Design a protein around this nucleic acid. Structure first.
Lengths: 105, 97, 73, 93, 83, 97, 78, 103, 95
DNA sequence: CCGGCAATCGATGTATATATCTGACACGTGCCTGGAGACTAGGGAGTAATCCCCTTGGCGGTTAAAACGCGGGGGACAGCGCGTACGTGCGTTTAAGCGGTGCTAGAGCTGTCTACGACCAATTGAGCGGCCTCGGCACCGGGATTCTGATGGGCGG
DNA sequence: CCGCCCATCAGAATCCCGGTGCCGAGGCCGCTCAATTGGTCGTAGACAGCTCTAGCACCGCTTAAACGCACGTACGCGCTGTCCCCCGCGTTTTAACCGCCAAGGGGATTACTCCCTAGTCTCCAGGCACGTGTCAGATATATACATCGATTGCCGG
């Protein structure tokens, strides 16, 4: 155990997050566990979005993920939709939706 | 002579354009319009291609959302045609002056 | 055409000048109507200090515009 | 000049979640922007929290309260669990 | 070179395509002029902010970062063009 | 005598658009606030200023919502406000998904 | 206790909003929307209170929560 | 004092101290507090002028939050600036839709 | 009785400069205090972000001017910029 | 013996299967810059103890608001008719898009040196808390003015 | 001759005036702590110079998209009738609001300590720029299936 990420068992960097915290003009001092907490949270959110996007990509018989799959993943989940409410994803598109009145009878 | 009834090709176009992701505006006219607009604030300016691309993406997203709100307002009044008063009502309720 | 000059004391005065009138003429009018000497007045419009040799049309000062007067002692 | 980014860590997370799919270049840019945005939001809220209570340090309590304030209902519980587990593991080792 | 008339380059079929992506079936004939006005207002605001950002940095070229910063300032985040 | 319908309504509109008082009784609002807060955490206390601020914010929110609802009702060629107008206003504003 | 928000109070709020005629089903909707708004604000305020290790909710917590939701409030010590 | 040198009413030293202990940047220049104090004083004077006119209209000698609300809501620039702000004990502008008025 | 600071005296001085015979109540004073604090925070945050973008460690009058231009709309920005420039010039001239 | 309803059938649009190639994604290498290990010094934050202030709980009364009922007029909704504006299609015209070519303005990097901001110490006056006093504003009673709706009247189909 | 439009009355409703009182705003005094002045030092940033890159301008050719015109239909808008449901008013109930009293919990301050974080130096390895191979996906072509609208047959009035 040499790096801090290995000690915490993460994939995201702890030292880089600590450096960004210390130079972003946020507070006079930064505690030891704050980078660990922040890195864990960021890794969790990334994992959630990537899992949903990968399922969407598989639904289309595709291998690689494109911004369309990210847009489909975000817009179909309530929590992610609330979080990314005022965000525009480039080359994303829209969810297919037609009002019931316009359909033929 | 084969001919479709009014409203069929409209639904087909709705289905087509809600499934793709390309830009729906020609690039040269938008570039010209952006340059003309920016000429008011400061002359002899230059633009990166990425700047115009980002501007186009933002504009298209804004217009699409506005049209969705306009459609809802039009349906509220027991109609299927969108009219300028629907645009005005949507903009006023959204808080845009 | 008429413009408004604001002073540090909150006093706003009205001036009748022309687009082709130079800043020196505007100044002379301000002394005539207020008694303030030529050397002490500094004019600020749109964050820029006006020049006596320039005209009002040079700085795009339109009708009913406002300029801030600075006294330099 | 060197330019740093989150690409490698995002790719490692993806290979851990879906070990067969890939990612394109624009999706990577979107993910980078997402990570930066969330980082800035949480950090700003934590700094404001520390300022309110007259403290000159940022600890894990500020981060916990920040993620409780920002993240919606069901995301917050799992995020808190992950952060607490990571901090406990770091302290133990 | 100073150019005008360029708002008419946003043709009626383009506005129709945008409406189709919006889910609209029938369009009145007076929608296009108001759409042009709305687009003009939006572009004016964003471009003003971007030019302010550019001139603070003493540059003669508008970059994508300035556009992203302006859009974030107006409360419209945009993912993909850096940032 | 008797006033025709709609007159006293206009009188109340004029009277209540000129005053600045709070339009909700204080004890019921206090009770509602306490029982709402008891879900997130029990054994809690409130400053009087806290309840006053809560009442002010909620009243302003409701008044603005009713303004938007009236606009939506007028759009549909009506003078009576209905729950669908509230739903349309909330949906266009962004609170309702 | 949501029924303590009587119908005349809602009518007075509507009058201040400029509404002339009111349907009979508006009061239930108004109660629901008010309850949702209060729940959000009180959740945020209680979180702010608990971070400070206090057992009393102050006006500062309410002001901070409202500012977080995007509704600044003047006149209470902001 | 620095306010006397700049010919201001608002405090320059206090603004400088607030800038330095607010976690905004590593260093703060000499003219930034002066600029900020001038701008703040200007905005205060504008709002107070409008509110005082409103107070004089009602035959009153003291300003109350109703007058501040009337001053803010009747000006386009101030309304744009304070768009998402609620003023306690303020009220609303009188406004009735023309459709509701009797024939 | 810990000392608590505010902007009351300066607001009253400005008011007496504008309307020589006019008072103010306590609630209006609270509202004015909140307004001043809010505008201060907005301008300071915008200037700090501007300095961060261009890789600078100092906040100068240029950052304040650009923040005022970005935040204040219309003629408010012009008049505020003129006032700030005049104040800075007067401060520099005097010593 | 036609009308409405339901079952065909041709045209058309869209999804599916099969090479083909190509530009983009995934992997391999050097180095250099930032992160980790070890140690020291100091101040920020935790902990304990006091105090007194504000919040909670209970009691009595009074009176103003709320709840309930009734009668009626106006508005909301459904149905019908008309006419015009918008959708679908076709032939013609235009400019967007692609592919090169050249040129130059300007963005980005590097070295220097200097003025500007931080830090430290002593001093002193501006601002905050506490106390008083009086005048602007709230309250009550009375008169004046203003709409508003019923009543009488006049008129034209 | 009678339904529709117009002028005129009393009656609540809001407002203005005058007298009374009373509580909050404006002014004054003492102290303390934060801003001012003077001096020293280090580095952040302005300035000059050079390099190369990407943004701008011009030309030629294709062809797909835009534009103009015609025809028909289906949707929007206006009118009419009814039916019921909100509004205005009167009576009875209830509980909010005000005043008063009492107790105790917890918020705010102070003193002390110790341990967690910043700062310094050394060392080394992880991540970024660059370069290369190959395969996932876009393209072109052929084909099968679903859908829509006109045609026609059948039960029924």
């Amino acid at each position: 155990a040499k790096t801090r990420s290995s000690r915490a068992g993460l994939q995201f960097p702890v030292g880089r997050v600590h450096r960004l915290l210390r130079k972003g003009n946020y507070a006079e001092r930064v505690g030891a566990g704050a980078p660990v907490y922040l890195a864990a949270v960021l890794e969790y959110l990334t994992a959630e979005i990537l899992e949903l996007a990968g399922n969407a990509a598989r639904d289309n018989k595709k291998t690689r993920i494109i911004p369309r799959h990210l847009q489909l993943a975000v817009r179909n989940d309530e929590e992610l939709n609330k979080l990314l409410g005022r965000v525009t994803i480039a080359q994303g598109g829209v969810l297919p939706n037609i009002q019931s009145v316009l359909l033929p009878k | 002579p084969h001919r479709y009834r009014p409203g069929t090709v409209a639904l087909r176009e709705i289905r087509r354009y809600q499934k793709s992701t390309e830009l729906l505006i020609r690039k040269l006219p938008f570039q010209r319009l952006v340059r003309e607009i920016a000429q008011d604030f400061k002359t002899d300016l230059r633009f990166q291609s990425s700047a115009v691309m980002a501007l186009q993406e933002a504009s298209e997203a804004y217009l699409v959302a506005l049209f969705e709100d306009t459609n809802l307002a039009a349906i509220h009044a027991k109609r299927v045609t969108i009219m300028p008063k629907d645009i005005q009502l949507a903009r006023r309720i959204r808080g845009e002056r | 055409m008429q413009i408004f000059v604001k002073t540090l004391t909150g006093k706003t005065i009205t001036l009748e000048v022309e687009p082709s009138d130079t800043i020196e003429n505007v100044k002379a009018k301000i002394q005539d109507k207020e008694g303030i000497p030529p050397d002490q007045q500094r004019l600020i419009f749109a964050g820029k200090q006006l020049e006596d040799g320039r005209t009002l049309s040079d700085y795009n000062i339109q009708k009913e515009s406002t300029l801030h007067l600075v006294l330099r002692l | 000049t060197r330019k740093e980014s989150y690409a490698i860590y995002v790719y490692k997370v993806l290979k851990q979640v879906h070990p067969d799919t890939g990612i394109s270049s624009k999706a990577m840019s979107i993910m980078n922007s997402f990570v930066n945005d969330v980082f800035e939001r949480i950090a700003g809220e934590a700094s404001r929290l520390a300022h309110y209570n007259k403290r000159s340090t940022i600890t894990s309590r500020e981060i916990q309260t920040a993620v409780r304030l920002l993240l919606p209902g069901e995301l917050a519980k799992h995020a808190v669990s992950e952060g607490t587990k990571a901090v406990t593991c770091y302290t133990s080792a | 070179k100073v150019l005008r008339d360029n708002i008419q380059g946003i043709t009626k079929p383009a506005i129709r395509r945008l409406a189709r992506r919006g889910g609209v079936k029938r369009i009145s004939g007076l929608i296009y002029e108001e759409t042009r006005g709305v687009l003009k207002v939006f572009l004016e605001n964003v471009i003003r902010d971007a030019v302010t950002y550019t001139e603070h940095a003493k540059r003669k070229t508008v970059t994508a970062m300035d556009v992203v910063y302006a859009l974030k300032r107006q409360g419209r985040t945009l993912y993909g063009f850096g940032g």
